[model samples]
Target: DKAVDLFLDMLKEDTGTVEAHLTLGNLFRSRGEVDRAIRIHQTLMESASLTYEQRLLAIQQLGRDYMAAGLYDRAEDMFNQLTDETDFRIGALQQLLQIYQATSEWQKAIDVAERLVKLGKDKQRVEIAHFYCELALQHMASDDLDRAMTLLKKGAAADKNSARVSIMMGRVFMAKGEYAKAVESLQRVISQDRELVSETLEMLQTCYQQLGKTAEWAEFLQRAVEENTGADAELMLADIIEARDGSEAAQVYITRQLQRHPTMRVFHKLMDYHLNEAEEGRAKESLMVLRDMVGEKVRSKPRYRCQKCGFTAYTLYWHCPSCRAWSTIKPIRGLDGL
Candidate 1:
């Protein structure tokens, strides 16, 4: 507060003190007094006596002030004007990207992101891919599958390593009833990050079912169990066994898996199978009680968590709901998780 007053006093003493005005404007902005900052910056921008560099700085600060005040249209206008200047281009483009994202103008964001990448900002490829994915999703919602697939392919080209691209491609294939293609796309996701295999398992199973490839699905589950050493694939395999053979076979399979890697989910499944097999007697009542207890425990546990922010969820999220980061949430890895 004192520094702002001193700078304001200096500005009053010498209206030509551009540094004092800029400093006071930034100070007000830092304090969340955006209107005061905008006033100061606007005064500097109107000064015909200021040099080119000084005018640019003043315009930048004023644009930021408008952004802080939620005047996005005005802020965008200012940033757009500065985008032609080599010294301000990158910063201006970054601000414009934020505006486009905030307004959900994904195509405009893509344009800005392409410019950034062309200017040697290679690290933005992942973000650009996600922007393309966002556009694809919009097209998908509108039932424009052709355009959506093209955009998804573009997204994959932008960032070949992005699992989201594969996942969306799998969904697109599924929508087209191309179950074989869907399985291929979803399998690519598991190959990219086995930790995400659990997420694709359900989709892959659906694709196999559509193609009448239950045997192939079962084989895939068996391999996944052997490789991942988690309860998800094992439990899925147990279900397949029960469907093909009987509850007795599933019970034996789950018991062996529980011995190898104990988890509440598998234990819960075992209890349910036991309850189903139990006869009408004191044994049945005991099995029912055990099943309820295990079911409650499993239901209370979080299945997914954000690795970056520790946000927990019962279901999977591609983006962290709390931290808003992409591909940060994964199936919790432990005795409690898959």
Candidate 2:
């Protein structure tokens, strides 16, 4: 209970005095009493008692205290001072990175992130890649297509497994009117990360339409359906087949899909063609009523769910709002799913 007094008594000696102050301030910071922590560390900084190395340690800890206090500008300056020191280099760079992230200083974020990467923190792999993508998003907003494309390429280079980069590359190429390149980049998601298949499917349709390769799109849809992605590929494929052949063919395809991996959206489709082919009078009227009801149910169901947090979404969200995980949401499947 009287640990402060205990430490003060012990620090009446020499050797452990600096570490004691550091530890005491860190204890307050860790427990969320940042004002006390800041004062304790600031008091340490005011002392002529500390040696040169000891002063640097005190500065490093004070930076953390300021960060804990949410005094970001103060923390940024303090950490920037520590970045050239031998022992605090990594620690200071990391703190500076956090400040940039919180402030959305993306280019500044990239500068520190590149230093950390070169310093051998290999696990920044995805996070720094996201920073590139974030910067690219800014360029894209300003309609700087060339710069945006270059940043996205750097993102892909930084993390080869990033489906987000591939998806964004698709967007950049689509904006540049390179439908073939857009299709190629979007299709890379199938092999790179299948969880995003439903996400890229709609864009792929547009790319195929621009290229006038309905036949090629049909082939890819065939593979997606065979892969049993349940990615709404079946619905689109059925439409293509019906337009090429007849309603009889589309009915056969939807019925088979229901038998294997039934979903309400496809079930609603089956009901639609059934209503279309039904005989006139009371039977046809009854089918129309049922069709509208089923369509309503299907439309209301959520189409995507976050694999990390189980958050349901009505549309594709590249970043999960619930858990903040990137590229983890996928198309919902099974009986009740779209």
Candidate 3:
């Protein structure tokens, strides 16, 4: 605070001191005095004595001040002007991307992101694909399946390795009642990222059910379990076995799995089977109580976790809500995970 005051005093004594004005403006912004910061930076921008680089710096600071004040329109205008300035082009476009994302203007975000990629920023491909997916979702919400599919294809073109694109493409195929295509798209998700297999298991089951391929679904689950030991395929296969056979058979299957790879989820399923088979007596009551305890513990635990930020969630998220990272959240591993 003392430093800010000193800089402001210096700026007052020499109105043409660009460095003092810039420092004071930044200090005011850091202290949450946005209006004061904006005024100072604007004053610098209007100065005819400032060099070209100094003017660019002043515009950047002023643009940030407008954003801090929630004046997105003004900020957007300033950044658009700066995009033509080679020295500030990349920084300005980054700010423009943030503005478009915050406003849910996905089309504009896609445009800016594509421009960034074309400028040798190819690392943005994943983010660009997600923006395309967002635009596809908007089209899907409006019942425009054709446009949604087109956008999803573009998303895949942007990043062929994106599991999100395959997931959404599967949804679109399902919406169109094309179960075969849906299955193909969803299966690609597992092939690309085995850790994401849990996310597509339910959807894959639905597709198989719609196509009346129960046996095929069962076989797929069995193979998936063999391939990924820590996946949720075992739990899903157990449910199917119980439905087809009996609780006793399901209990036997889960018990074998638990012996091989003990997990809380399989243990819970095993308890469920025992509870169902118990008779009307103290044994039954005790089983019920035990089942309830196990169920509560499993229910309270998170099924997904972010690898980048250690954030946990009960369900899968394509983006990490805490860290704002793409595809960081995955099914939690170990005994407590899917």
Candidate 4:
């Protein structure tokens, strides 16, 4: 509230100080006071005694304020005007791309992203790849498999290390019952980053099953367990054993894994397996109740975290989507995650 008051004071200052109004407008927008921000910039836009730089700055602020208010059309007008100015063009293009993405305007996003790439802003190349992936997803949703594959290929070329692209490509193959291609792409996701090895394990089982090769699937699981000893891998292996052999094998696997790490998730799974296979009906019921109590505790915990910003997510992420840092998200297998 104090911050809002300060911005308002700055906004009401003399027209000679257009920079102050712009700054205040930005502050208001940041504070979620879009109406006040728009009014300040609108006042600056109508001012007669403003220089070119001041006018451009005010327009940019107004456009950003409009965007904050979800008024894309008004923001597009102001951003479009600045696309020819070298100083502001990059920012303008980026803002336009974001608006296009928000509106699901994939074609426009692709156009702006290509322009951004041509301007030598390769740092945003991954973002452009995601735009292509979005386009491919749209096409795939409409049953255009060939066009989707083409776009996925483009995405892979644009950002070679894009796990998102590879994952989706693997999904497309899985949908077509092309297990070989699915394994190829999904395995590449692991090679791209070992953190995703667990993500591919279940899909690998599916691929092997579809080919009538359950023994081969077990071999693959063993390889994954040997190479990637993370909690995800271990948990997946336990599930595999339980499905093939019974709760007893799963309990043994989970106990062995817990002996190495002493994690809560592993311990919980082990207890549940044992409880399910208990001989006495009353004892099994009691253990089932205990398992539920512990399961609730485990369910509230996070399973993955970003190494860079410490942001936690239950699901996996190839990139720290919050921080936009590539290869920074890791499987959280320690005390907190378990």
Candidate 5:
């Protein structure tokens, strides 16, 4: 077609014409004509005049075009070859790692990440940690907690600042009724980042209760409320009060918080607690209905959001699933700076 004529004309004048092919490939890729893009890059690669840099670039484009066209086998082949090349080795490895992740190829991702560590790319350690964590999750899903623990330890060593890994470790230990170990891992998250106080506090409370240490859990929750000045923290503090004293104490705590900063979540929690204490049948039922409405409003809204990508999740994520940015997600402060 037009491509053959254009390449022939470029060849007639000069053999050192990589840009024309590259540009044509880019145009095809942009237009969703990925097969054409692959042909263009493949043709360019065969040219003896193509420089090393040009060859690397052509390989990248060819792999990317294959990926775009869902020809992962070809993309994998190109990337695997490029990974051993000295010039574009890191970039190729990264692309291959992403492809492995997208395709749920955890074993291959683990291998590539290990290779990345061997190459002394320290910055990639965090992502490598995530890959290990992913593998651990898969293992856990398959009822292989022992294997999951091994992988989790490897992940923790790779990136000590990974809050998600710590959280998952806490969850696994807690599920196994290892309260002390769960607390040890979960408590480390507070210093890793304070904004995660809401997510881990409830887990900590449950761990403490399972060990019959409610008194210590209340003290820990009080400290958490003092450290984190938001509605979620205050609401969690109210739960501690409700457990330690009664709904009266929780109500008093909510009133004090409301005077300083009003929040719908706190208001809803306060109402739900009091509704159980309402006197007479009709009045109690009325309050119960109102509590249900308020509870629905709060529950339907997102509790946390990623600052980097605006990705909202009911549960907090230390690493945003959408943007892959670490420590960017935070408690969704309702309008009152909660």
Candidate 6:
């Protein structure tokens, strides 16, 4: 306490800048000495002669110190108070959003996101949509499909271009077994973001299968294969042709696709068909697959990837656990995906 008296006595002479205190507080916080950081800021707060702006800066640093120490509630209070200060409102709301996100408080995040949007942080729309999606997932966990659908609609309204919202809308339709609606929703992905089209293929096929529209599904995939815009369309069409026709027909289709797309997955399937032919005829296109499953090919690389962060994963994550990016994890489009 005497130390503070001595410090404030020096400040009383107006030589010490408030910025110096804040800078030290920031460094201490970054160095994981939030206790000392708190001391610097709280002491600044006690100086009766400091201007109001300086006082607010002291409180702001104190909140940051609390945040560094994982005292979220206190940190929240600081930011919440700062939100009333016009100059600090934007930064404070941004920090409050972080607090809510760290706590998985989706409803609170939605409110902050809304406030941020009105405050001219236009990029918050995407985050707002995702927050609603998170809430929908919670309702989905409780088997509340209708409520989940409602939240997802709200999500879509927040960002019509959000492929995540569209995908979730497709998923909700699927859970309700409304295959036609599901197909419609999944098809929207094709136009909204073709990079995500591959992710929708299985659901689209399943919807067609359930609706007994195999012929239409085959034609749709064939169209995609011809258009060359579809990610996995050729491979999927190859599967459909294999089931509908025979190995010879499927082998012909895949070889043709391989010549065009030159994709590893189609090449992998080509190997499979050759292996089946050999096993059936009791014959060497590749006897290598038996080992491929357990050998160098599978073990050398990861199956899925987060494009945003270069986070390679064996399992697909709709939300990248490493980067926290949505819809970034897809099966590797090259050799590993095979």
Give the top-scoring candidate (TM-score): 3
Q: In candidate 6, what are the lDDT values of residues 18-52, reduced to their tens digit?
A: 76677766877999988978988887677787898
The residue-by-residue lDDT of candidate 2 on 131-160, one tens digit each, is 889999999989999999899888888888
Q: Write the per-residue lDDT of candidate 4 for residues 61-128, one digit (tens) a residue.
A: 88899899999989999999899887899999999988887787877877898898888978667776
Best by lDDT: 3
Q: Least lDDT summed over 10 consecutive residues: which range in candidate 3?
A: 1-10
For every model shown, what is its TM-score relative to the native structure?
Answer: 0.86, 0.79, 0.89, 0.76, 0.82, 0.86
lDDT of 2: 0.83
- TM-score of model 1 vs. true structure: 0.86
Q: Give all candidates' CA lDDT scores.
A: 0.84, 0.83, 0.85, 0.78, 0.79, 0.79
Across residues 225-337, which tens digit of lDDT does each residue of candidate 1 receive? 87773688898898888888988988999999888787888888888876766789987887788778878877888888899999999887765679866678888876656
Any runs in candidate 3 off by more than 4 Å, and if so which? 1-7, 11-16, 229-231, 243-249, 279-287
- How displaced is residue 242 in candidate 2, in Å? 1.7
Which segments of candidate 6 are over 4 A away from where they belong? 1-17, 223-232, 279-300, 336-338
The positional error of residue 325 in candidate 3, measured at the CA in angstroms, is 1.6
Residue pairs with backbone atoms closer than 3 Å in model 5 (clashes): 231-338
Worst 10 residues of 6 by lDDT: 280-289
Clashes of each: 0, 0, 0, 0, 1, 0
* Lowest-sum lDDT 10-residue window in model 2: 8-17
RMSD each, Å: 3.4, 4.2, 3.0, 4.9, 3.9, 3.4
Tell me the spans in candidate 1 whose CA falls farther than 4 Å from its real position.
1-7, 10-16, 82-88, 277-290
Which pairs of residues collide in candidate 4? Answer: none
What's the C-alpha lDDT at position 134 in model 6? 91
TM-score of 6: 0.86
